[PDB]
Amino acid sequence: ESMITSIGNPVQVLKVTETFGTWIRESANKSDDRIWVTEHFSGIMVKEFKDQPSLLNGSYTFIHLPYYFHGCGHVVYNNSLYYHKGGSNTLVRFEFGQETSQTLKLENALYFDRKYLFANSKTYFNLAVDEKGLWIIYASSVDGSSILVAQLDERTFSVVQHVNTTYPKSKAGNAFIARGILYVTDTKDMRVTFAFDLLGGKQINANFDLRTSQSVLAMLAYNMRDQHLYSWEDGHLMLYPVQFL
Ligand SMILES: *[C@@H]1O[C@H](CO)[C@@H](O)[C@H](O)[C@H]1NC(C)=O
Ligand SMILES: *[C@@H]1O[C@H](CO)[C@@H](O)[C@H](O)[C@H]1NC(C)=O
Ligand SMILES: *[C@@H]1O[C@H](CO)[C@@H](O)[C@H](O)[C@H]1NC(C)=O
Ligand SMILES: [Ca+2]
Ligand SMILES: [Ca+2]
Ligand code: NA
Ligand code: NA
Ligand code: NA
Ligand code: NA
């Protein structure tokens, strides 16, 4: 029903020295100013910034996680961080307020040995939230290739539908999900060249430009709160507008 037709010019919010990382805002209807950051491909700490002025000021508080993260594909939904427990096929839900956590295993997902979903960012699992669901993008350990998406029930942190896109990870740079549609970039992370209607179970044509920069892309995520794409590009924290049709 609602497909992206183009991506606007990016805004640079901050530049830092860490080539790879993520920056994340709350996605739910909450009026939350906080920004969460991780750096590098593994660790057990998150930097919490009160708001965007604090981000620009370098003023944060460390959050110690219950399990090490891997990668740059985490997401925040309803005051919980959803992330990949490094070296396992386990995803973690960590509630920021109560500091409790729950775990979910995806048994037929690649998760080690550099058999990545997105090689460009060493991503095994890309967690995402949009208007239509809470999602995990991953790659099949049955065939070593196919991009799969799990639809979760947020109330039980469990999978309710497994979607096989049939698209080979070798052709994917990165991806995001918006209004129920998976969008996958080319291997250079410059254009979106594949899309899939997740709940309808079918591929849909998509071919549109994403960005002109060639800097390495660590993270790419749609936030339904503001309908922007958030990215981390060679240490540059960027936001892009998106145009729907
Ligand atoms: C922003 O950074 C400057 C540089 O040290 C500092 O003086 C100022 O207090 C910071 N703003 C805060 C902490 O709100
Ligand atoms: C969010 O979390 C709160 C507290 O854990 C809970 O009451 C609520 O049902 C959750 N979901 C939404 C959509 O707020
Ligand atoms: C997904 O589809 C591919 C291509 O048809 C197939 O090889 C694979 O077994 C399917 N399921 C999984 C979990 O990969
Ligand atoms: Ca491989
Ligand atoms: Ca190859
Ligand atoms: Na930082
Ligand atoms: Na381009
Ligand atoms: Na690139
Ligand atoms: Na992504």
UniProtKB/Swiss-Prot annotation:
Instruction: Give the subcellular location.
Output: Cell membrane; Cell projection, Axon
Q: In which tissues is it expressed?
A: Specifically expressed in spinal cord, brain, placenta and sciatic nerve. More abundant in peripheral than central nervous system.
Q: Domain (Olfactomedin-like): give its ranges.
A: 1-245
Q: Could you state what the record's PTM comment says about this protein?
A: N-glycosylated.
Record comment regarding domains: The olfactomedin-like domain mediates NFASC/neurofascin and NRCAM binding.
Q: How does it assemble?
A: Homotrimer (via collagen-like domains). Interacts with NRCAM and NFASC/neurofascin. Interaction with glial NRCAM enhances interaction with axonal NFASC. Interacts with MYOC.
Role: Ligand for NRCAM and NFASC/neurofascin that plays a role in the formation and maintenance of the nodes of Ranvier on myelinated axons. Mediates interaction between Schwann cell microvilli and axons via its interactions with NRCAM and NFASC. Nodes of Ranvier contain clustered sodium channels that are crucial for the saltatory propagation of action potentials along myelinated axons. During development, nodes of Ranvier are formed by the fusion of two heminodes.
Q: What is this protein called?
A: Gliomedin
Species whose genome carries this gene? Homo sapiens (Human)
Q: What is the lineage of its organism?
A: Eukaryota, Metazoa, Chordata, Craniata, Vertebrata
UniProt gene name:
GLDN
Q: What range of the intact protein is shown?
A: 301 to 545 of 551
